[PDB]
Amino acid sequence: MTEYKLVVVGACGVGKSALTIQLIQNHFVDEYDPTIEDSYRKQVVIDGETCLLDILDTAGQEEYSAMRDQYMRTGEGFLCVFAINNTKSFEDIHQYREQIKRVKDSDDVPMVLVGNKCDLAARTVESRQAQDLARSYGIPYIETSAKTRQGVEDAFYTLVREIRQH
Amino acid sequence: MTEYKLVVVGACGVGKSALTIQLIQNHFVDEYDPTIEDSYRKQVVIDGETCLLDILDTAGQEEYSAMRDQYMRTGEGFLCVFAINNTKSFEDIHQYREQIKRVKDSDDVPMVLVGNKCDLAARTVESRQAQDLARSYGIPYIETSAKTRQGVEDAFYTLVREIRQH
Ligand SMILES: Nc1nc2c(ncn2[C@@H]2O[C@H](COP(=O)(O)OP(=O)(O)NP(=O)(O)O)[C@@H](O)[C@H]2O)c(=O)[nH]1
Ligand SMILES: Nc1nc2c(ncn2[C@@H]2O[C@H](COP(=O)(O)OP(=O)(O)NP(=O)(O)O)[C@@H](O)[C@H]2O)c(=O)[nH]1
Ligand SMILES: [Ca+2]
Ligand SMILES: [Ca+2]
Ligand SMILES: [Ca+2]
Ligand SMILES: [Mg+2]
Ligand SMILES: [Mg+2]
């Protein structure tokens, strides 16, 4: 059985935990409890193949930035998440990309750019802006809502499909 | 409004028309009526962006192979479909890939490999085999069922997302 080591990264409060919990546990976490580092595992079938998802839900809090090297070495694919109502979180993506590239010593690490909170109307990052950033990285862009479940499976399953082209 | 010119290709009877009709019209065509060439259009929102899908549903019948050059020139992205219960249809994929590459004079034309009829149990093409073929092409592989609707939106929307990385 193939195991896929996925790691969810991004700035504080963009919805990393809510996305992961929605995928794994099928409910929306309304409250905000800052994460240190949590793991989830689930057996799923993706394109006819039974596999095991091992998901690491990481800290957006800058205080825990020292933990990044460790999880970037071990992860196989990265969900790089920002919130569409948080311009700064979008600007923060590049620092994650750059660290992952440096650590895995590769320009094509499996990755998906995720614009989360697409149910909210106070958008300050346009889809086209995120599309451009993802294009430069050579990776897909997918919008999600952990709240409505829109795009949540798609984002994670796309990341699996990216690990497979690797 | 961005328009995406998608073209669905593959051997006869793999489910090109059923896939397209499921996407556009939300029902499953049980009967088999061989296609000459049909067009469909639909406005959809994909990752926060309203766009227009222009879909060309092409012939799998070898008798209509002369029509291929024309539609390959005009199409922007290609859904390359085989059926997971039809080994020959999988083997036929390469002739579509090669023609598209030759016609658009490019090694990276936006494309998604689709293994359809994944609801059927008489599988003769393993996911891993199709994954390998897609990896060599540098494109995603997605399994679908036009019958159950599984993966149908995903396949077409992934092809849009591929046109965007282009
Ligand atoms: N409306 C809406 N709220 C969301 C969405 N995703 C997360 N939230 C909310 O945003 C807040 C922060 O979410 P959370 O998942 O904890 O963010 P995080 O990225 O894990 N934070 P940290 O990095 O501190 O661990 C929570 O109140 C959560 O309910 C979403 O898609 N839509
Ligand atoms: N069980 C099952 N049957 C399917 C599926 N997709 C198509 N079929 C069936 O397969 C037959 C052929 O489907 P069709 O869409 O017409 O194939 P096509 O690729 O368009 N053929 P052509 O190239 O001649 O135009 C039909 O009987 C249809 O109901 C699927 O996902 N599951
Ligand atoms: Ca809740
Ligand atoms: Ca029917
Ligand atoms: Ca989906
Ligand atoms: Mg968290
Ligand atoms: Mg047809």
UniProtKB/Swiss-Prot annotation, chains A, B:
<dbReference type="GO" id="GO:0005829">
    <property type="term" value="C:cytosol"/>
</dbReference>
<dbReference type="GO" id="GO:0014044">
    <property type="term" value="P:Schwann cell development"/>
</dbReference>
<keyword id="KW-0539">Nucleus</keyword>
<keyword id="KW-0225">Disease variant</keyword>
<keyword id="KW-0333">Golgi apparatus</keyword>
<feature type="binding site">
    <location>
        <begin position="145"/>
        <end position="147"/>
    </location>
    <ligand>
        <name>GTP</name>
    </ligand>
</feature>
<keyword id="KW-0547">Nucleotide-binding</keyword>
<feature type="modified residue" description="N-acetylthreonine; in GTPase HRas, N-terminally processed">
    <location>
        <position position="2"/>
    </location>
</feature>
<dbReference type="GO" id="GO:0032729">
    <property type="term" value="P:positive regulation of type II interferon production"/>
</dbReference>
<feature type="modified residue" description="S-nitrosocysteine">
    <location>
        <position position="118"/>
    </location>
</feature>
<dbReference type="InterPro" id="IPR027417">
    <property type="entry name" value="P-loop_NTPase"/>
</dbReference>
<dbReference type="GO" id="GO:0006935">
    <property type="term" value="P:chemotaxis"/>
</dbReference>
<dbReference type="GO" id="GO:0008284">
    <property type="term" value="P:positive regulation of cell population proliferation"/>
</dbReference>
<dbReference type="GO" id="GO:0043524">
    <property type="term" value="P:negative regulation of neuron apoptotic process"/>
</dbReference>
<dbReference type="GO" id="GO:0000139">
    <property type="term" value="C:Golgi membrane"/>
</dbReference>
<dbReference type="GO" id="GO:0008285">
    <property type="term" value="P:negative regulation of cell population proliferation"/>
</dbReference>
<dbReference type="GO" id="GO:0010629">
    <property type="term" value="P:negative regulation of gene expression"/>
</dbReference>
<dbReference type="GO" id="GO:0046330">
    <property type="term" value="P:positive regulation of JNK cascade"/>
</dbReference>
<dbReference type="GO" id="GO:0090402">
    <property type="term" value="P:oncogene-induced cell senescence"/>
</dbReference>
<dbReference type="InterPro" id="IPR020849">
    <property type="entry name" value="Small_GTPase_Ras-type"/>
</dbReference>
<dbReference type="GO" id="GO:0042552">
    <property type="term" value="P:myelination"/>
</dbReference>
<dbReference type="GO" id="GO:0090314">
    <property type="term" value="P:positive regulation of protein targeting to membrane"/>
</dbReference>
<dbReference type="GO" id="GO:0097193">
    <property type="term" value="P:intrinsic apoptotic signaling pathway"/>
</dbReference>
<dbReference type="GO" id="GO:0060612">
    <property type="term" value="P:adipose tissue development"/>
</dbReference>
<dbReference type="GO" id="GO:0030335">
    <property type="term" value="P:positive regulation of cell migration"/>
</dbReference>
<dbReference type="GO" id="GO:0048169">
    <property type="term" value="P:regulation of long-term neuronal synaptic plasticity"/>
</dbReference>
<dbReference type="GO" id="GO:2000630">
    <property type="term" value="P:positive regulation of miRNA metabolic process"/>
</dbReference>
<dbReference type="GO" id="GO:0050852">
    <property type="term" value="P:T cell receptor signaling pathway"/>
</dbReference>
<dbReference type="GO" id="GO:0042127">
    <property type="term" value="P:regulation of cell population proliferation"/>
</dbReference>
<feature type="binding site">
    <location>
        <begin position="13"/>
        <end position="18"/>
    </location>
    <ligand>
        <name>GTP</name>
    </ligand>
</feature>
<dbReference type="GO" id="GO:0098978">
    <property type="term" value="C:glutamatergic synapse"/>
</dbReference>
<dbReference type="GO" id="GO:0007166">
    <property type="term" value="P:cell surface receptor signaling pathway"/>
</dbReference>
<dbReference type="GO" id="GO:0045944">
    <property type="term" value="P:positive regulation of transcription by RNA polymerase II"/>
</dbReference>
<dbReference type="GO" id="GO:0042088">
    <property type="term" value="P:T-helper 1 type immune response"/>
</dbReference>
<dbReference type="GO" id="GO:0090398">
    <property type="term" value="P:cellular senescence"/>
</dbReference>
<dbReference type="GO" id="GO:1900029">
    <property type="term" value="P:positive regulation of ruffle assembly"/>
</dbReference>
<feature type="glycosylation site" description="(Microbial infection) O-linked (Glc) threonine; by P.sordellii toxin TcsL">
    <location>
        <position position="35"/>
    </location>
</feature>
<keyword id="KW-0832">Ubl conjugation</keyword>
<dbReference type="InterPro" id="IPR005225">
    <property type="entry name" value="Small_GTP-bd"/>
</dbReference>
<dbReference type="GO" id="GO:0051402">
    <property type="term" value="P:neuron apoptotic process"/>
</dbReference>
<dbReference type="InterPro" id="IPR001806">
    <property type="entry name" value="Small_GTPase"/>
</dbReference>
<keyword id="KW-0342">GTP-binding</keyword>
